[PDB]
Design a protein around this ligand. Structure first.
Ligand SMILES: [Zn+2]
Ligand SMILES: [Zn+2]
Lengths: 1523, 107, 57
C-alpha cells in the first residue's frame, strides 16, 4: 500500500452468477486441445496447458498481452467438451427439477394454479412484503380451466397492486427490499415448493405418469420403467393428445427434457432463481446446470511447484490433461459414428459405446471440480472444491487470516525500567523494520541523517523511494553515495505528472513509533495492544513490563510474542489512541482492572509505606528522582516539588507515605485538586499492633495520611488507588502513576532488598506445643467417624468384630463409602482448621512484617494462608476425586495399614508439614492427590476455542449505531439500546460510587467540563419527563408487573442520552435519588445531581463500538477458567454449549423450580414431592419367590413380597389400591409379552455359528509427549484459529436435522384378559403380598423366570407424571421456598395451584419455556442460565453482553444457536463461505443470483474494503475554500 | 374466540380463515388454566397502532422486517391476537437499566 | 543447580518484505526463509474488537 498511489474506483457489490458457454468462447485467449504440456527441446506445445497465449511461461513473452512473467497477469483459456456434462455443484438441483417435471406436456407435475401460487408468493418476497404473500392464500373463489384462470388473474392482480402500493411509499425500492426474515420466508417457500414438486406422482396438468429417475453417488442418472397400471394409463390418455395437434439416460436427454420445462415453466423459475427482482431481464436457461466448455485458468495459477532442485508437475494440469485425452477420444468415436448406416438392428452396442463416452468425460469433469464425486483410482488428486476447503479452507487460511510483512517474533523477557506502555525492541529488529516516511521541509533534517546512517546504523534507513515510483536501495552503498542522495531528497520534481508527489524514506523503527504486541491465543482484544517502541542496545529478546502480564496472560516461562509494525499514519493513530495499552486498563468483561504491579513491587510497598519506614533529605529526594524524571516528561510542574519533613526536630525526616504523596504531586495536573479516597487493605490492623488504623487507606487532597499500599491498591484490583486515579485524572495519568510506582519499588527493592528463609517457616516452642496438642485429638476422630456412619452406640472399639463386618458393607458400595469419607473428612478438617487458627499467626516464631512468608500471603504479592498453613502446620486430609484415599479389595489403603483401619492417617489425613517433613505413607498419599490434578489437565476435552469462534462469526458485524441502537452489519436492529441504558462497561464503575464522586466533586467537575457543552444539550425536557415516570412508578409499587401502568415509558426511550441531561436509566435514577435521601451533607444536593447526570452522559458507549465481538470475547475468554471437572445439573462449558452452541430442545438435566406458598408447610411440601416423584414397582418390592414346579404343564408360582403397607405409603405416597391396578393391568400384560418373546428367541437361534468369524471386542509419539514437550510446539506455532472441535463437539455435530367372593369375580375377569395366568390373590386387608400362578405348555421347557420378573419390575411404573422423574425439596435459595423438579411439564404443575405459585414457576429448559410462555420468556431464561454458569465459577460477566447474545438468539422469534443452522438466516454469503461448507454456501448464493452488498466484516475482508465498524462507521471529507 | 375442550376435526380447522375480514381464534381450555402474561418472566406486551408503528419505523429509519421478530404462533402473540405486520412494545425489567422498552414485529 | 539443554529463542525472527507464494501473493511460511508471521482469525477478531478498521486493513 502506497499513499502516493490513491485509487479512484471501488467495488460496491459482488454479483453471483453462472458463466455461459458462449461467454467463455469469446473471452478465451486460446482453445486447449492437447493433453501434452511441453514439446521436445522444452518449448510449450501449441494448444496445450502451458500455451504462451495463457500467459508468459519459461522466459518467453505472453502471446496475448506481450508482457513477461512479472507484469503479465495471465489469461483464461477454454476446453471444448465434445458432449455436455453435468456441473457437479448444481447436479442435485438439476436432479430435483428433472424428477419434478412431466415427460409429456413438459410442465412440472404440480397443478399450474398451485405453481402460480408459489410464483406469486415468491414475486411478493423479492420485495420486503411477507404479510402480502400470506394474504395471497386468502384469495379463493376437478375444477374448470375458465374458473382456475380467473383465480390466476385475481392473484396476479393482487400481486401487481401490492407491489405498486408498496413501491409508491418507502416500503420497497425498484431493486427490492431484502432482510434476514425476508430471506427466511423465501428459503421456507423455495423448500416447500420443491417438496410439493417432488411429492406428485401423476401429472396434475395431463394425467399421464412419468418414469421415475434414480441416482448414484457420482453424477449419473437412470430411468426406472413404468408399471403395467401406469402403462395402461398412458394408452387411455393417448387420444386426447391427437386433438390438440432401469436404463441409463444420456446428459443430452436430461438437458433436452429440462430445456423445454425451463421454457414452459419460466414464470415460476424466474422468482425461484432470483432473490431480488431480475432487472437484467435475463432468461433462466437449463444450460446453466450443464457444462459445454471448461475454463482453463491462467498459467499464473497453474505453475509447476519447485522444491529445491526437483520441479514437480502442477496437480490441476494433470486433471486438465485427463479431460483433454477423453475429449479427443469422443471426437474420434463421433467421427466413426458419422462414417457408419444402412446396417443397424443391433443398436445395443452403439448406445453402450455412447454410455461409456459420456460416463468417462463426466468423471474427468467431476475429478477436476470435486474429487469426492469421481471413481476410485488404484490418495486422489484434489479438485477445485478441495483447493477451497484443503484444511480450514482458502477463506479461513488465506482471507480471514494472512501472513504479514513488517512483523517480528521473539521470546519475551521482563523489564521494570521501561514504561508500562512501552516495548523493549532488540536492535536486530530495529535495523530491519522500516516505516515509509515521506520527506518534507519539517523532517528533511531527521531523514538526511537516517539516509547517511544507512541500513546497519540505527536510527537509519534501508531504502529511498523517488517521486517517479522507483526504489533506491541503500544496502550496498557506502557513506559517500548516501551523503549524495541525502542532499537530493528535497529536490523539486521536474516531471509535471509527479509534481504532486514527494520522495519517501524507508527509515528504521524509531522510539516514537507504534507497534502491535500480540500473545497467542488472542482470547480477548486486550491480548493485542499498541506499545511504544523503545530500542534497547545489546538485546536479543523483546522486553516487556510486569503491568502487561495480566492482559496478555503471558508468563515469562519462555513465552513468545508477535510484534506488528503498521505502515501508515491512520494505522498509527489507531494503535496509539484505540488499541494502545493505557486505554485497556479496564477489561469490558466486568469493567475491572487488568493492569497493575505483580510481586516485588507489592512486597516493596508494604515495607515502604510502613510506619517504621523513615528517610533523610538525601534518601527522600533520591527516591523521587529515581522514579520521576522531568526530562522523560514524567513531571507536570517542570520542577520537582517536595513536601516538608514529617519530623523537624531533632533530625529532619520524611515518612515512607510522603514519597507516595510526592509522586502523585508531580504526576497529577497542577490545575486539578488532589485525590480524595477512603479504601481498605488486605492486611488486618491486628498485624500492625495495638490501636493501628493501618488497614484504612486514606487519601486527602492527594496525600497518603493513613494505611499501607497492597495488591488491593496498585495491583489489577477495582476501587484501589490506581483505579481511583484513573477515574478522576484519566487513563494517561493512571499509566504514569503505574510506571512511576513500578520504578520506585524497583529502586526501593535495590536499596532495601526483600528475602525469604527458614526463619519465616518456623513456629515458636509455644506455638509448636499447641500444634501437637490439637493433633493429639485427631487419633480418636478416625474411629469416632467410623462408629457414627456405621451406627453403633457407646463408641465401639477399633477391633470390634461387628464394626469390622459393618465397615466391609461400606467398602463394597460406592455410595456407602462416600457417606463414610465425607463424615470422616469434615471431622478431620475441623481438627485442621483448629490447628491453623491457633498456630497461625499467634504461634509463629517470626511474625509479620518481618516474616516474609507470612507477608507475601497477606500482601497478595504471592501465595495464600492455605499454602502457609501446609508449610508451618499440616497438609491436612488428602482429597482424591471429592473423596479420601482409594482402598483395596482387602480393606487396606496401603500394605502398611491394617485391613479396615479406623485411623485418620490410613484415610489420607497428613498430620505432617513440609517444614518438619512427611512420613512415607503420607508421601504416597500426597503423590496420589498431587498427580490427580495433572491427570485432570490431561483428560479435559472441553475447549472454549470453537464456542468463541461460533459467537464471533455471527456477532462480528453487530455494533453501536449513531442512533444509539445495536445494529447488525446489514442494518437489521438487534437491540434498541445497549443493555437498555447505552453505558460503556469500561466506564460503569464509579457511576454508583456517589460518596467517592462527592469527595472529588470539583476534581470531576473540572474533568467533565460542562462550559463547552451547556449550549449543545437540553437541561429540562428529560428531567421533567423523569419525574412523570417516577410518579406513575410509585403509584403501582405494590401492584404486579402485568397490572403496571403503560402510560409513560422510560425517559431513555423518548430522549437521546447524549443530547438530554436527565435521560438516565431508571436503575441509575432510583440509586442516585436514594443516595441524596439517605445522606444529608460547598456542594448542594441539586448541583451533585447534575454532576452525576453529566457523568452518565460521559459514560455512554461510542457509536461504532463492536459490541458483538466484545460480547463473544467477554463470554469466551472467562469460559477458559471453567475447563476443570465437577468437585447433578450440567455446569461449565458443556452447559454453555447446550445453550449458545446447540440450542438443545433435549437438555441433559431438564429442571423446574416450583415456588411453594407460605400456607404449605415443610411436611406438606415433602408429601407433595412424593406425590409427583416417579414410583416404580421395584421400589415397593422386598422379595420375589418363584416356585417352578413341572406337573401333568410348567407351573410358575410368583409371590410378590412387598415392604409393609405403612412403609411405602409414607415413603412413596402409594396406596395398596394403586398397587393392585398396576399389577392387574400393566405388570401381567408386560410379563406375558416378555415370556412369549423369550420362547420365540429360544426357538429362533438354537446356538452361535461355529467357524464363522464374529466381530472383535475392541500422533502416537504426540500422545507420549510430556507438557514441556507439548507446550514447546504450541510456543512456536502461530494458531490458524480458535483451537479445534475434534473432541465431544464433533460427535454433537454428528446429528442431522380359600378365597372371598369379591376376590373370585376379580380373578375370573383377569383370567379372561390374560392368556397364561390361572390364579391371582392379592393382600387386600393388610396389603403386604401379591401371589399369582402362571401355566405354560409342555413344549416351553426350562426358563429363568426370576431374571425375567426382576427386569419387568424395574420397568413397571406405579405412578408417573409425564416427562418428570423426581421432585426434591432443597434448602431455600436466597430465602425463597422452592422445589426442584428433575423434568419439565408446566401444564401438569398448573393443576397444583394450591401448592405452587404458577406465575413464578422457573425452568432451565429454554425450548420448553419458549413453547409455553413465549420468545421473551425464553430470552430471559437464556440470560439467567448463562449467568448461572458464570456465577458458579465466581466469574462476573456484564449482563449487557448476555442480553445482546440472547437478543441475537431470539432475533427470528425462535431459539437459534451459534452454528451452521442458525446462520442459514444471514444476508452475507461471503460470511457464510468463510465459516464452513464454502462450495455449498457459494452454490446457494449462485442459485439465488444473490448480490453480496459487502456490508459484513467478513465480506469486506474478502474484497479488501475497509471494515464498517469503529473508524469505518463514517467518512472523512476535506473542507476546501476555493469555489 | 372459540374455546374447545379436547380436539378439533382437521376438516373443521380449515373453516377458520375462510371468512375475511372476520378473524377466528381457537384456544384449548387446558392451556388457558394459567395466564402466561401473569408469569414473572413474561414482560408487558402492548400491541401498537398503525400510527405508533409508523412513528417507530421513522425514529430508527427501520423497514418492517429489519426489526426483532415475534412468531405469529408465539404464546403471547396468540394471547393479544396479533396479526402479521403488527408491532408489539415490550417493557422489560433489566438488571442493568431497570424498565427498558424494546419492540418485536409479528410475522 | 542444573542447566536445561533447551535454547528457547530458537524461533526468533523478523521480516520487513520477504518472499511470497505465487497463488495468494502473501508472505511465505518459514523463519529461515524470511517468512511472515500469521495474523489468524482470532487476531482478526481482536482488531474488529478495538473497532480499529485501519489496523485490520
Ligand atoms: Zn499476458
Ligand atoms: Zn403433464
Amino acid at each position: 500500500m502506497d499513499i502516493s498511489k490513491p485509487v479512484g474506483s471501488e467495488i460496491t457489490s459482488v454479483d453471483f452468477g453462472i458463466l455461459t458457454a458462449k461467454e467463455i468462447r469469446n473471452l478465451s485467449a486460446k482453445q486447449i486441445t492437447n493433453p501434452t504440456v511441453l514439446d521436445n527441446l522444452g518449448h510449450p506445445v501449441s494448444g496445450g496447458l502451458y500455451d504462451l497465449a495463457l500467459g508468459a511461461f519459461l522466459r518467453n513473452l505472453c502471446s496475448t498481452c506481450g508482457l513477461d512473467e512479472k507484469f503479465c497477469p495471465g489469461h483464461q483459456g477454454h476446453i471444448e467438451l465434445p458432449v455436455p456434462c453435468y456441473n457437479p455443484l448444481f447436479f442435485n438441483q438439476l436432479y430435483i427439477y428433472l424428477r419434478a417435471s412431466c415427460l409429456f406436456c413438459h410442465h412440472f407435475r404440480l397443478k399450474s394454479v398451485e405453481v402460480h401460487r408459489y410464483a406469486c408468493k415468491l414475486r411478493l418476497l423479492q420485495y420486503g412484503l411477507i404479510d402480502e404473500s400470506y394474504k395471497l392464500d386468502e384469495i379463493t373463489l376437478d375444477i374448470s380451466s375458465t374458473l382456475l384462470n380467473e383465480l390466476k388473474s385475481k392473484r396476479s392482480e393482487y400481486v401487481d397492486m401490492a407491489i405498486a402500493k408498496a413501491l409508491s411509499d418507502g416500503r420497497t425500492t425498484e431493486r427490492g427490499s431484502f432482510t434476514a426474515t425476508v430471506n427466511d420466508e423465501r428459503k421456507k417457500l423455495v423448500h416447500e415448493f420443491h417438496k410439493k414438486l417432488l411429492s406428485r406422482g401423476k401429472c396434475d396438468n395431463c394425467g399421464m405418469f412419468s418414469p421415475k429417475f434414480r441416482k448414484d453417488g457420482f453424477t449419473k442418472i437412470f430411468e426406472t420403467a413404468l408399471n403395467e397400471k401406469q402403462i395402461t394409463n398412458n394408452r387411455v390418455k393417448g387420444f386426447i393428445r391427437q386433438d390438440m395437434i432401469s436404463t441409463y439416460i444420456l446428459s443430452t436427454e436430461v438437458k433436452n427434457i429440462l430445456d423445454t420445462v425451463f421454457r414452459k415453466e419460466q414464470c415460476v423459475l424466474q422468482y425461484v432463481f432470483h432473490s431480488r427482482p431480475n432487472l437484467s431481464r435475463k432468461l433462466v436457461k437449463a444450460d446453466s446446470f450443464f457444462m459445454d466448455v471448461l475454463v482453463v485458468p491462467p498459467t499464473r495459477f497453474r505453475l509447476p511447484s519447485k522444491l529445491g532442485e526437483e520441479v514437480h508437475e502442477n496437480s490441476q494440469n494433470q486433471l486438465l490433461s485427463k479431460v483433454l485425452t477423453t475429449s479427443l477420444l469422443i471426437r474420434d468415436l463421433n467421427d466413426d459414428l458419422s462414417k457408419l448406416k444402412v446396417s443397424l438392428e443391433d443398436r445395443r452396442v452403439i448406445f453402450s459405446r455412447l454410455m461409456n463416452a459420456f460416463v468417462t468425460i463426466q468423471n474427468d469433469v467431476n475429478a477436476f471440480i470435486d474429487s469426492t464425486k469421481a471413481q476410485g483410482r488404484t490418495v486422489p488428486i484434489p479438485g477445485v472444491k478441495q483447493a477451497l476447503e484443503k484444511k480450514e479452507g482458502l477463506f479461513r487460511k488465506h482471507m480471514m487470516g494472512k501472513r504479514v510483512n513488517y512483523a517480528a517474533r521473539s521470546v519475551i523477557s521482563p523489564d521494570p525500567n521501561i514504561e508500562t506502555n512501552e516495548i523493549g525492541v532488540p536492535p536486530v529488529f530495529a535495523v530491519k523494520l522500516t516505516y515509509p516516511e515521506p520527506v518534507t521541509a519539517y523532517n528533511i533534517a531527521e531523514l538526511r541523517q537516517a539516509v547517511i546512517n544507512g541500513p546497519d546504523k540505527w536510527p537509519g534507513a534501508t531504502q529511498i523511494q523517488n517521486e517517479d515510483g522507483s526504489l533506491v536501495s541503500l544496502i550496498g552503498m557506502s557513506v559517500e553515495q548516501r551523503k549524495a542522495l541525502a542532499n537530493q531528497l528535497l529536490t523539486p520534481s521536474s516531471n509535471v505528472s509527479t509534481h504532486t508527489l514527494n520522495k519517501k524514506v524507508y527509515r528504521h523503527i524509531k522510539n516514537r513509533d507504534v507497534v502491535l504486541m500480540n500473545r497467542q491465543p488472542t482470547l480477548h482484544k486486550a491480548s493485542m495492544m499498541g506499545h511504544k517502541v523503545r530500542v534497547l542496545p545489546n538485546e536479543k529478546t523483546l522486553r516487556l513490563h510486569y503491568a502487561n502480564t495480566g492482559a496478555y496472560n503471558a508468563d515469562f516461562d519462555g513465552d513468545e510474542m508477535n510484534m506488528h509494525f503498521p505502515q501508515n499514519e491512520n494505522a498509527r493513530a489507531e494503535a496509539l489512541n484505540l488499541a494502545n495499552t493505557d486505554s485497556q486498563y479496564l477489561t469490558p468483561t466486568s469493567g475491572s482492572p487488568v493492569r497493575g504491579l505483580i510481586q516485588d513491587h507489592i512486597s516493596a510497598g508494604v515495607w515502604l509505606t510502613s510506619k517504621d519506614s523513615f528517610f533523610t533529605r538525601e534518601q527522600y529526594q533520591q527516591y523521587i528522582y529515581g522514579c520521576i524524571r522531568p526530562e522523560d516528561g514524567h513531571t507536570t510542574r517542570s520542577k520537582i516539588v517536595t513536601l516538608p519533613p514529617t519530623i523537624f526536630k531533632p533530625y529532619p525526616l520524611w515518612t515512607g507515605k510522603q514519597i507516595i504523596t510526592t509522586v502523585l504531586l508531580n504526576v497529577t495536573p497542577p490545575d486539578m485538586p488532589g485525590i480524595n479516597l477512603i479504601s481498605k487493605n488486605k492486611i488486618k490492623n491486628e498485624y500492625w499492633g495495638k490501636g493501628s488504623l493501618e488497614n484504612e487507606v486514606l487519601f486527602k487532597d492527594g496525600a497518603l495520611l493513613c494505611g499501607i499500599l497492597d495488591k488491593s491498591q496498585y495491583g489489577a484490583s477495582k476501587y484501589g488507588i490506581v483505579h481511583s486515579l484513573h477515574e478522576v485524572y484519566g487513563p494517561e495519568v493512571a499509566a504514569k502513576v503505574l510506571s512511576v510506582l513500578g520504578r520506585l519499588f524497583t529502586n526501593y527493592i535495590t536499596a532495601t532488598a526483600f528475602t525469604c528463609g527458614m526463619d519465616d517457616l518456623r513456629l515458636t516452642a509455644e506455638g509448636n506445643k499447641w500444634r501437637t496438642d490439637i493433633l493429639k485429638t485427631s487419633v480418636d476422630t478416625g474411629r469416632e467417624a467410623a462408629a457414627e456412619v456405621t451406627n453403633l452406640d457407646k463408641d465401639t472399639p477399633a477391633d470390634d468384630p461387628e464394626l469390622l463386618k459393618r465397615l466391609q458393607e461400606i467398602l463394597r458400595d460406592n455410595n456407602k463409602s462416600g457417606i463414610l469419607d465425607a463424615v470422616t473428612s469434615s471431622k478431620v478438617n475441623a481438627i485442621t482448621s483448629q490447628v491453623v487458627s491457633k498456630c497461625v499467626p499467634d504461634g509463629t516464631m517470626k511474625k509479620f512484617p518481618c516474616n516474609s512468608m507470612q507477608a507475601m500471603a497477606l500482601s497478595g504479592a504471592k501465595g495464600s494462608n492455605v499454602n502457609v498453613s501446609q508449610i508451618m502446620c499440616l497438609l491436612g486430609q488428602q482429597a482424591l476425586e471429592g473423596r479420601r484415599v482409594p482402598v483395596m479389595v482387602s480393606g487396606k489403603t496401603l500394605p502398611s495399614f491394617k485391613p479396615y483401619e479406623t485411623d485418620a492417617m490410613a484415610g489420607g489425613y497428613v498430620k505432617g508439614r513440609f517444614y518438619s517433613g512427611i512420613k512415607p505413607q503420607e508421601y504416597y498419599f500426597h503423590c496420589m492427590a498431587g498427580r490427580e490434578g495433572l491427570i485432570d489437565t490431561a483428560v479435559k476435552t472441553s475447549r472454549s476455542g470453537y464456542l468463541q469462534r461460533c459467537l464471533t462469526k455471527q456477532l462480528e458485524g453487530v455494533h453501536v449505531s449513531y442512533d444509539n441502537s445495536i445494529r447488525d452489519a446489514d442494518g437489521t436492529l438487534v437491540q434498541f439500546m445497549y443493555g437498555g441504558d447505552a453505558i460503556d462497561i469500561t466506564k460503569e464503575s464509579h457511576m454508583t460510587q456517589f460518596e467517592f464522586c462527592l469527595d472529588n466533586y470539583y476534581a470531576l467537575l473540572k474533568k467533565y467540563n460542562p462550559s463547552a457543552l451547556i449550549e449543545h444539550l437540553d437541561v429540562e425536557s428529560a428531567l421533567k419527563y423523569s419525574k412523570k415516570t417516577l410518579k406513575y412508578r410509585k403509584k403501582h409499587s405494590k401492584e404486579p408487573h402485568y397490572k403496571q401502568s403503560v402510560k409513560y415509558d422510560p425517559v431513555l426511550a423518548k430522549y437521546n442520552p447524549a443530547k438530554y441531561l436527565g435521560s438516565v436509566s431508571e436503575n441509575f435514577q432510583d440509586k442516585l435519588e436514594s443516595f441524596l435521601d439517605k445522606n444529608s451533607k460547598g456542594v448542594n444536593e441539586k448541583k451533585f445531581r447534575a454532576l452525576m447526570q453529566l457523568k452518565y452522559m460521559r459514560s455512554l458507549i461510542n457509536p461504532g463500538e463492536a459490541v458483538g465481538i466484545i460480547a463473544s470475547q467477554s463470554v469466551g475468554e472467562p469460559s477458559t477458567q471453567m475447563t476443570l471437572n465437577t468437585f447433578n445439573v450440567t455446569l461449565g462449558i458443556p452447559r454453555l454449549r447446550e445453550i449458545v452452541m446447540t440450542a438443545s430442545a433435549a437438555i441433559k438435566t431438564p429442571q423446574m423450580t416450583l415456588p411453594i406458598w407460605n400456607d404449605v408447610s415443610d411436611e406438606q411440601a415433602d408429601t407433595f414431592c412424593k406425590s409427583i416423584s416417579k414410583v416404580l414397582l421395584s421400589e415397593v418390592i422386598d422379595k420375589v419367590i418363584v416356585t417352578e414346579t413341572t406337573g401333568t404343564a410348567r407351573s410358575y408360582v410368583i409371590h410378590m413380597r412387598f415392604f409393609d403397607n405403612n412403609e411405602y405409603s409414607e415413603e412413596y405416597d402409594v396406596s395398596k389400591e394403586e398397587l393392585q391396578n398396576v399389577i392387574s393391568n400393566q405388570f401381567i400384560h408386560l410379563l406375558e409379552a416378555a415370556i412369549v418373546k423369550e420362547i420365540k428367541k429360544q426357538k429362533r437361534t438354537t446356538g452361535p455359528d461355529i467357524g464363522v468369524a464374529v466381530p472383535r471386542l475392541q500422533n502416537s509419539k504426540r500422545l507420549e509427549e510430556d507438557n514441556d514437550e507439548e507446550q514447546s510446539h504450541k510456543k512456536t506455532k502461530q494458531a490458524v484459529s480458535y483451537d479445534e472441535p475434534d473432541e465431544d463437539e464433533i460427535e454433537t455435530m454428528r446429528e442431522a436435522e380359600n378365597m372371598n367372593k369379591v376376590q373370585r369375580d376379580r380373578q375370573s375377569a383377569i383370567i379372561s384378559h390374560h392368556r397364561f395366568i390361572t390364579k391371582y390373590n392379592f393382600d387386600d386387608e393388610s396389603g403386604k403380598w401379591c401371589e399369582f400362578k402362571l401355566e405354560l405348555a409342555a413344549d416351553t421347557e426350562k426358563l429363568l423366570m426370576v431374571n425375567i420378573v426382576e427386569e419387568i419390575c424395574r420397568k413397571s411404573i406405579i405412578r408417573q407424571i409425564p416427562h418428570i422423574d423426581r421432585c426434591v425439596h432443597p434448602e431455600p435459595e436466597n430465602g425463597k421456598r422452592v422445589l426442584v423438579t428433575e423434568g419439565v411439564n408446566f401444564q401438569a404443575m398448573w393443576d397444583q395451584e394450591a401448592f405452587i405459585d404458577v406465575d413464578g414457576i422457573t425452568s432451565n429448559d429454554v425450548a420448553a419455556v419458549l413453547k409455553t410462555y413465549g420468545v421473551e420468556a425464553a430470552r430471559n431464561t437464556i440470560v439467567n442460565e448463562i449467568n448461572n454458569v458464570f456465577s458458579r465459577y465466581a466469574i462476573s460477566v456484564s449482563f449487557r453482553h448476555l442480553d445482546l447474545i440472547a437478543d441475537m438468539m431470539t432475533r427470528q422469534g425462535t431459539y437459534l444457536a451459534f452454528n451452521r443452522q442458525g446462520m442459514e438466516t444471514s444476508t452475507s454469503s461471503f460470511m457464510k463461505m468463510s465459516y464452513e461448507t464454502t462450495c455449498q454456501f457459494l452454490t446457494k448464493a449462485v442459485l439465488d443470483n444473490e448480490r453480496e452488498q459487502l456490508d459484513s466484516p467478513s465480506a469486506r475482508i474478502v474484497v479488501g474494503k475497509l471494515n464498517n465498524v469503529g473508524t469505518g462507521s463514517f467518512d472523512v471529507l476535506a473542507k476546501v475554500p476555493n469555489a | 374466540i372459540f374455546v374447545y375442550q379436547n380436539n378439533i376435526t382437521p376438516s373443521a380447522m380449515k373453516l377458520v380463515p375462510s371468512i375475511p375480514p372476520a378473524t377466528i381464534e381457537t384456544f384449548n381450555e387446558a392451556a388457558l388454566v394459567v395466564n402466561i402474561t401473569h408469569h414473572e418472566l413474561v414482560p408487558k406486551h402492548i400491541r401498537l397502532s398503525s400510527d405508533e408503528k409508523r412513528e417507530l419505523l421513522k425514529r430508527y429509519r427501520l423497514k418492517e422486517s429489519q426489526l426483532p421478530r415475534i412468531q405469529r404462533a408465539d404464546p403471547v402473540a396468540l394471547y393479544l391476537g396479533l396479526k402479521r405486520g403488527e408491532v408489539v412494545k415490550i417493557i422489560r425489567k433489566s438488571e442493568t437499566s431497570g424498565r427498558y422498552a424494546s419492540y418485536r414485529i409479528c410475522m | 543447580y542444573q542447566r536445561l539443554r533447551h535454547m528457547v529463542n530458537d524461533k526468533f525472527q523478523v521480516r520487513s518484505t520477504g518472499p511470497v507464494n505465487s497463488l495468494t501473493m502473501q508472505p511465505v511460511k518459514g523463519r529461515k526463509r524470511h517468512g511472515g508471521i500469521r495474523v489468524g482469525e482470532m487476531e482478526r477478531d481482536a482488531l474488529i474488537g478495538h473497532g480499529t478498521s485501519f489496523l485490520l486493513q
